[PDB]
Symmetry: C3
Subunit: 347 residues, 3 copies
Amino acid sequence: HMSLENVAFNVVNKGHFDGQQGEVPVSIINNTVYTKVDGVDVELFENKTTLPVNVAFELWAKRNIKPVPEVKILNNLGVDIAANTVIWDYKRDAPAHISTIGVCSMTDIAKKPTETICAPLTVFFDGRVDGQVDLFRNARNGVLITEGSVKGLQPSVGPKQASLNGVTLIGEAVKTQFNYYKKVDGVVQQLPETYFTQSRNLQEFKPRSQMEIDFLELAMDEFIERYKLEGYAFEAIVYGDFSHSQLGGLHLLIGLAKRFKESPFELEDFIPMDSTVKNYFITDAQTGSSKCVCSVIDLLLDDFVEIIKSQDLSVVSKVVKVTIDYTEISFMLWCKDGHVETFYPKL
Amino acid sequence: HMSLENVAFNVVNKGHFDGQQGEVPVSIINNTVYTKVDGVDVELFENKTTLPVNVAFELWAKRNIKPVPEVKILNNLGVDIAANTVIWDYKRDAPAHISTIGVCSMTDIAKKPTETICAPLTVFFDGRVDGQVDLFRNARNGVLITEGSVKGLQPSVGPKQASLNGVTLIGEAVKTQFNYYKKVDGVVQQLPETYFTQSRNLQEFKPRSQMEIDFLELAMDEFIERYKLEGYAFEAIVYGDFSHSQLGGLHLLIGLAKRFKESPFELEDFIPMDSTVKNYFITDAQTGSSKCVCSVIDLLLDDFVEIIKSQDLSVVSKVVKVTIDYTEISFMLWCKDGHVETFYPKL
Amino acid sequence: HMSLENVAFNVVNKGHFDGQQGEVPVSIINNTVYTKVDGVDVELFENKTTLPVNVAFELWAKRNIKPVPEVKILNNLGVDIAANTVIWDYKRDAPAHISTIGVCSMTDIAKKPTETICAPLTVFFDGRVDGQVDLFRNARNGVLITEGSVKGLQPSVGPKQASLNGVTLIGEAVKTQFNYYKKVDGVVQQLPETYFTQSRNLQEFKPRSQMEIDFLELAMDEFIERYKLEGYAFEAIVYGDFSHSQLGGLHLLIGLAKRFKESPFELEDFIPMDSTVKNYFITDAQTGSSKCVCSVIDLLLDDFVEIIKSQDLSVVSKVVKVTIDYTEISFMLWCKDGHVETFYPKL
Ligand SMILES: [Cl-]
Ligand SMILES: [Cl-]
Ligand SMILES: [Cl-]
Ligand SMILES: [Cl-]
Ligand SMILES: [Cl-]
Ligand SMILES: [Cl-]
């Protein structure tokens, strides 16, 4: 018994769609949904998606409000669609997936993930939901998360963090650490050994190791001395070189955090979406040093150290491949006389 | 001699409509009003209302720019329309009232509040304006504010604060404390004894009593000890319980302020409007504890203490009714063995 | 070989238009440009201009990403159009000029500034670009910037600061100090002696002289004493008088910065554009003092001191004209018994 007015009743009275009965008066103007309260219109939803306003409204209302994998993880694993839920993409302000299963009659391709239309799609299954483990067992293509073990299946330990109503966090009152499983053409896959990005932000950056505390509290030379990093070119890769018109390096999020706390700067996020490597057009306000495409990745500094110390440094240039967030990220490594010169990602 | 181009002339040259003569060139695209300056278009107004763009522009331009009652107060008193002014609703970014009297030919139902069409409407009258007291005396339904006494009429002392160009404040260079009066079907009403909410915000929260200073500077146990509040369950009602997936309590704005200064969190304001009780979908970034509908009220802590200490605590559950901002707010009180368990509002 | 899909390819892969070959899939809905990534639409550009969405997108993409004169300077010099570039106006979120030369086939009036249609227009030429000095020499009307001397032409030293991707700054890793030249009807112009505004903002305000450091660290009376400013009415002009309903003075940006650091307030920017004098509707949150049109200018305090100390103070009221940012700004000077009473700009 689905209806625009009933979706709005749930948003007004429950904060989201909860399956409660009721109606409130609704107006649609431009891409915006309003409801009438004490005689005046109140905005409930502004559509920023490429879907029709009332469809986007319903999917937003029906979003998963438990901790869920970050969208970049789901993307990297090839997820096309979710079983009987909506993963809302808060970095795009839109649904993570174009179609649905058992959610919304305007976007559903099926009511259940067992229907034939779903076979070529990589369906996301949530073991926290009754019966979805068994649906993963029966599905041709899929990704499954669980909180515990699944009998017979070897797990891959996922990131510590997950997304709860658009907030990425390491749960204390709720669990955000998942096991991951994947199937392709009916065959369980070995998922690769992988690093994970930390999904932190520049302002409220918080270190997660002693090495990272030292990086943010020591001077560049004192830190490089303590961790014996001469020759790996941290001065440019991590800290950033602001002395020439073309901004040098600055590829680790922690480097930007250190800089930002000292001297602010501008980060144009010109592909606003969730992804393992982010590209920014950066302009440093103090110096005028800038760079059109500054690839930035948020690795735990210890992990980045392990990576760069695990390469052969005897060639002018080479592609270095690293599995991060279950996807292969390609880095360019440039070396001169056995020292790194630069080492930066690519999107 | 009203005109779009003349409204725009006033906005460009006076900041608002002042009744000055003049025209500037104006363009309308989408819901936005532009004016031409040195050959280029400059945005003057983005329509976020459900009214036509040029109508909304004119009402915004003609908004009252003196301290006026906060919209929630006017709503709680049943005000339908204002006499010869526009109360702009800054929390909705729209007019507080759908129709006007003597303001705008597109929204006017009348030029003067004495016309017949106005009789069933509760008209807002401003005693600071010449002759509006006498119009209130003659009106069938209305609400009146004044700065001083009105001969023959018993006043109700309003909130200390009022709204000036969307800024809620307790005036020092201007007066924001009003007397209130109300008429229904030609009969002066006794207005009820009422508490008032304090209309503060979470970030720049500022305490207004010694008890509130103590609440923000002491630890939970030291504060509860000083004010002898054992058994009233402040630990959950006011301070918030973040230890389980479902966020406990947190119903007083001052509690959120204390928490926010320590550990930030997310407050989705999913019915963005002015009202005595606000509902937020809250996600605590540190713990992952969350709640879809967290009812929040900004009472002076001393007032909330008086309320909760004035209840009978011998029943498992009961509705407690409290007059706040001239409206009856219903609270749920839950008690176990003579102690409060929880006590929270409802919108 | 221009195309919407190729402009989008450049934005996705280079941060801006770089003339690279390639296409990506593009959707246009409302005034927004999206591109398809891994099967979902991602927003690349929201049109806030009065131009068609795809045209605005292309001009934004083709914006000058080197330090360029601030738009107010170009406006004050009468610039109509730029030679073979786009000056993007970040305060309006739109092109600084309506038409182009050699940029975009939808807005071009010409491919080269030598075409006849350009003769009556004041063309902006950038000496940092090969051959534009010589085009300025041949143009009937134009403005030229250079980093160094131009043989035969006497320069005017421009502001220290310029705009780089919307960030106004004094360059250290890049040069932002330009020489300026101007021609009208084929005749080189003497540009006037001029003060320049400092283009700072209220929050992150940074002083640029010892006098300004003293102004922000001393009490009003101690500062006025040190710089012997009795009788010039700084108390109202610069510091602001918040004691009456009508806010007194507050015409220097540094005064607002001092106030803002102490007690926040509201600044409605009701003509959002770049200009030498800005008009704000200001409401002081602490006191309720307010003013519909508060003219604000960001002069180096030493420069403002020089100006006000260089006037005759023997008349009740007079217009004082001052050349700032190459334009004549008119001030009202009011004096009583040989003392300034107020002295404030006009836009
Ligand atoms: Cl599970
Ligand atoms: Cl690998
Ligand atoms: Cl009065
Ligand atoms: Cl009551
Ligand atoms: Cl040059
Ligand atoms: Cl002059």
